[model samples]
Target: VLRGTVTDFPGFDGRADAETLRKAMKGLGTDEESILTLLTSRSNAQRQEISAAFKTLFGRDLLDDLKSELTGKFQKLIVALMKPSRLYDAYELKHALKGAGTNEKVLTEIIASRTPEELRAIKQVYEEEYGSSLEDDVVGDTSGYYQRMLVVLLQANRDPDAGIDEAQVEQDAQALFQAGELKWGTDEEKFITIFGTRSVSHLRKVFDKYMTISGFQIEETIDRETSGNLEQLLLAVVKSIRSIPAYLAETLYYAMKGAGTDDHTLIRVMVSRSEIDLFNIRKEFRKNFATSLYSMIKGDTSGDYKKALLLLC
Candidate 1:
């Protein structure tokens, strides 16, 4: 995680911040410039305290004021500052599963990249905010092997110990080979069990041995043998374990690549990763794409929005 943009301001006071935000929005016209300066420069922790003071002092919600006064990408930046990191993540995941089409990329990034502790927190937040089980939503939305595998992973119970066993890696590789490439039908259960319970370090070895055993890269085998969400989830797990920054860099590239910007993806990655491996992700972007990340942001964005992201980058 890279947190270059989140340094504390000495002699900072949240009460003053809350009061300034109040006056900015209370005037005839909103002070977009002041709001941007106040929100972006301050850390999320400070913003949280500012919002609390805004509510107590003004008898008004800071979020409501920001929503009413702000517009466009700048507004999105303001709104992003309002939510705590995990709450924002929970909101993203809820939105991902809420609509007719699921945003599987969001699902993969949030769930796959998080530690077991972080995933447990998200599950708690999902239930608290949505009044439904995250597990149930997942089950209802997805089906088959992928669904089962995801349901298990969502439990956030991946073994935390990094203690690796060469024998276990050997055994797991053979099981994977026999289950997928060598057998008449793929034993998806074996794949799920090995993926679910093994520590990442252990799985790293398994993947290498699997290649020697099967004469195919594990990713290629997964791509060839599995279809749909299962394949996506499997690939995500491998990428997450191998290098989270690279995985995230790829996701950010996809978000910005199409006809228009995926604003949700853009904000989520920029804000969340700004303090967590964003530097590594930026290097990954430049290495893989042959252009600087800063250049891409400059190209895709305009106005204060561009300035805000650049500041963070």
Candidate 2:
């Protein structure tokens, strides 16, 4: 089962929250404290209800009002919390692909980690909100084997059904061996075909057999054979398949590691997965790094942004 940090607010009152937010923002100076405190406590579903209630009672958009009142990274974090997770993902994906240099990191984190159902919903929302196909956007922005695998993922057609062919697992593993370690050069198409389409159950088994035949882990081989965005995307798929929480834990670490924090990734992962798997991510983070995600966040960030993130953590 998935573990998430945010839970439903007991005795939740959208009308009350809407009114409270109105009072906080009514004056010359906004009570940013109250806004962050109130919003960070509610789940995204509850936050959506608060948005609706705000519109119903105040005849003004809560999002617009919040934008007017808040500023900087704090505003961005609050805005991220307000949107439904799928819509947030769609927006992130669009933003990633729309600009000059594509945000391949965002694209890979989202497309690789989502389940088939979630991916389908994100794709639908992406089309509805942007008036263009997600696949088309990806195609327009990216190319090569990376583009092929991403297109396959965007199809949301991964085999989710239970049961895998025991014999076929061996064949798939052997095929992968021939595709990479046994070959003069990597056959990316074969890797993409098997990786993009197979059930996770099957792929997990194949990974096991691949170690037997190739003496190379799937991720290691992908790292050895591929480079650039393609490598990142393929490795993301492999890590996600192995353990999504673990994958996200690593993402969170890198975002917070080294000289400067990747606030974009830190915020995105914290906001989006707050209600999905942040609990497990926290667990994995501590397990892997021997430090609590909460403490690291506290140490790394400051101001209301850090406060809100600490609450979510």
Candidate 3:
């Protein structure tokens, strides 16, 4: 989701020259300022060229050298700043917590929030590197609904083109009305079917149409009908559909607020969503809150946390 045109370095030749790259790498230590300016400010493709040049020049991997040079989350931040393959590799390393202390929070943050397309890429990269399927790993490491959700996500074959069936929506609304609003509460099946199966864009359109037809927002209808945690989940889904940016802003706000900020949640959401929707989320955050997303993150986090978040921005 990081947007804007990546400018080409006009004076520099393409990175096919090994000697030129060798000189550049050799200069990095003494001219650290120039190295950081070039590497950090360049596009991913530019970085890749430099990486390849580094190997050709010095018979050493640029990422490896950078890894050794950097430490802690700054290292992680730099590595993520590399190509997609390198980023996927880093994600794989994080998820390889099959030992006694598995980070379920990390797992959920990455797996749950990724778009279907991103998940597919992650799955392929994970299998290619590990010689096994990501789905198999998820099953082996997780359990119950959490596992089920992860599996559903790993499938990554959602029908993004599927459109709204107005009749079906009416039927679902009636079911909700009957189950919860009428007298006895209805099961979550109807709501889940409509939400989980539909594309977010399609669902947004559906909600707009539904409000016009039914004379109430879906949230109002759900409030009138459903109760409990199910209600909260449904409401969140509706809000997410109605305005994903505001929804994400609220998500980020909560992740950084209060006692013991949800670092896992913060990392997962920012990293996973960065590729897909962070650009939109930033615009929405600014529109809704009258402030910048980067400013908000800077105010709330510090050190490596802030560095990681800045990488995505």
RMSD of each: 2.8, 2.0, 5.5
Q: What TM-score fits each model?
A: 0.88, 0.94, 0.69
Q: Each model's C-alpha lDDT?
A: 0.80, 0.89, 0.59
For 6-85, candidate 3 gives per-residue lDDT tens digits of: 33345544364334434544634533333444544455566677777767656788777666656665556556656553
- Lowest-scoring 10 consecutive residues by lDDT in candidate 3? 27-36
lDDT of 2 by residue, 1-313 (tens): 8889898899999999999999999979999899998988998899999999999998999999999999999999998999887699999999999979798889899999999889989989999999999999999999888788899888878787588887889998888878766431477877787889999988999999999887778777667423588778878998999999999998998888889999999999999899888999999999999999999999899999999999999
Clashing pairs in 3: 179-186
What ordering of candidates by TM-score runs from best to worst?
A: 2, 1, 3
lDDT for each residue of candidate 1 in 1-313, tens digit (9 for 90 to 100): 4534455566779889988888888868988778877777777778888989988898898998889888888888778867887687888888888979788778767878877887889899989999998899888777788778888888888876667889888999899878766431477887788987799889888888988887876777666423467777878787888788888887778777858987778888888876567888889889988887788888888887887777777
Worst window of 10 by summed lDDT in candidate 1: 1-10
Report the error of model 2 at residue 61, Å.
1.7
Please report the candidate that would top lDDT against the real structure: 2
The clash count of every prediction, one per candidate, is: 5, 0, 1
By TM-score, how accurate is candidate 1?
0.88
